[PDB]
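re: that complex we talked abt at group meeting.

here r the seqs, copy pasted straight from the sheet so there may be weird spacing, ignore it
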Amino acid sequence: EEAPWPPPEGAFVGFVLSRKEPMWADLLALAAARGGRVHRAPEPYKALRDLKEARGLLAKDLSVLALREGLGLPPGDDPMLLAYLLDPSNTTPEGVARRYGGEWTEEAGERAALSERLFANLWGRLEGEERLLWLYREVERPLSAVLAHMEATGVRLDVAYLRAMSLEVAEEIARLEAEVFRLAGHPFNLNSRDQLERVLFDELGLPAIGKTEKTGKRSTRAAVLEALREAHPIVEKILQYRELTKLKSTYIDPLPDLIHPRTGRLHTRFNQTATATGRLSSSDPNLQNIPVRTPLGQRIRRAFIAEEGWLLVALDYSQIELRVLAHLSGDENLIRVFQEGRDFHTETASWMFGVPREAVDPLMRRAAKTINFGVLYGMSAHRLSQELAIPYEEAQAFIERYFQSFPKVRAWIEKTLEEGRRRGYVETLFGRRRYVPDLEARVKSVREAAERKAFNMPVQGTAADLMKLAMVKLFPRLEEMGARMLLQVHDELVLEAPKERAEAVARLAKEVMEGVYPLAVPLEVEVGIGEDWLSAKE
DNA sequence: CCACGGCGCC
RNA sequence: AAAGGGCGCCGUGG
Ligand SMILES: Nc1ccn([C@H]2CC[C@@H](COP(=O)(O)OP(=O)(O)OP(=O)(O)O)O2)c(=O)n1
Ligand SMILES: [Cl-]
Ligand SMILES: [Cl-]
Ligand SMILES: [Mg+2]
Ligand SMILES: [Mg+2]
Ligand SMILES: [Mg+2]
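got the structure back, here u go
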């Protein structure tokens, strides 16, 4: 069953890393399988040079390690991508092997054999699924090479700035904690919401605003505290303490340790088979949880900087999910908002707060956004009434008035649920599927939860599909200009270009992103250039 | 790791 | 008056 290295062209690779992060790992073993015959590499790094592509489970990760080693080894077929298209609950090689056959072990030869076996199995299961195969060939497979480039290229950090920030934030946390304990009259677990609830609402007697979801306790969530800002001096201190503590522990302190000593850069890991709707995920750091608006969240982006002689170019799709909803629903009022170049959240804020659009400040706009997303995407009158501190019947009436402004959105939700009940799944514009078997559940809460998943997925997943396709379309032209693609998070992409090319790069990227796919509304992209991510994000 | 819950980012 | 989606974190249980 064994055979000498090197393998024939087209064989499936298997590999074992010393740790899960390819930029940080040694390649313990490398092997390839073809016709069930397995070829094991005598010297893994040397053997990488024999391969023309990385074809097999986790191909992107081997490509990342190859790039570190100065080798252009593009990722090719990967059964993980096939499995994820078949059903996005398929997210790990372990889970995929368990579901479809075989076993994910710690031996390279066995992994190579499994890759071959899973490719055949899953490819067969996809026969005739032309829309999923289009996603595979035109989005997922080429995107894997883009993600390999992003992860291996990494991004420069201003480590001196982070070190200073850590000292400054620690000092401020200490001051805040001390002042909180003084205002409270005693020390307590400032990280315990149960203890906070007691201090705020029993001991200091502040009025409670909201109830927690499941247990109906007095909520201490940020929105409640924000509304109690002027009720007691302790409140603003708690809010600040919570945020500083969180960002220090998750970003400010860990980031400098993630700088790779060989590259001098941070190598964020991107995963394209991780979420239920098709959104990309990042880890080490998870970029998702860096706040956009707060001073410290902004200071964190200031720590992400361009290489000397380069600039960062940051591009953000403006309200892409709402534009997708306009497209999918065909709602005329929604389409009109974007055709007329208006801001959805400002327009609706003006409507719901009864003030002119110019009077909609960022605080009001933030409040409106939270209401819009909650209402559009399925919040009940009960929850809305509690959070808005209004009677139930008033919240129920607001919801009806809201959808009366966008009548075809409701029609779209209903049609989507009707077809989903029939088919057992829902789909994005490009045909990415999420299975929703609980649409036929008899238990009311179980069925209704399935419905909310079902009509949310086509919007979020289509937005994600669009970003991924834009990345695929942009990448080769970027490389032609000597530029790099570094980060993707939220609705944003961050590139790095030589200073002399940055303006041309910004123009090209905006164009490619705005024209990625024709919709019933235009796509808008905001673009900025700077030596750091914050300066570029403006 | 799994469950539960509140809370936090988009 | 059963609780928007996605992704996380922590706490509590094991
Ligand atoms: N509470 C929230 C917040 C966000 N989102 C989803 C919907 C839009 C997407 C991106 O968030 P934002 O960029 O903040 O929203 P936006 O519509 O693009 O508004 P803005 O112009 O302020 O960015 O995340 C959501 O479902 N629920
Ligand atoms: Cl650098
Ligand atoms: Cl379901
Ligand atoms: Mg936005
Ligand atoms: Mg949970
Ligand atoms: Mg938040």
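couple things i noticed - Residues 247 and 297 of chain A are 8 Å apart (CA to CA). The longest strand of chain A covers residues 27-34.
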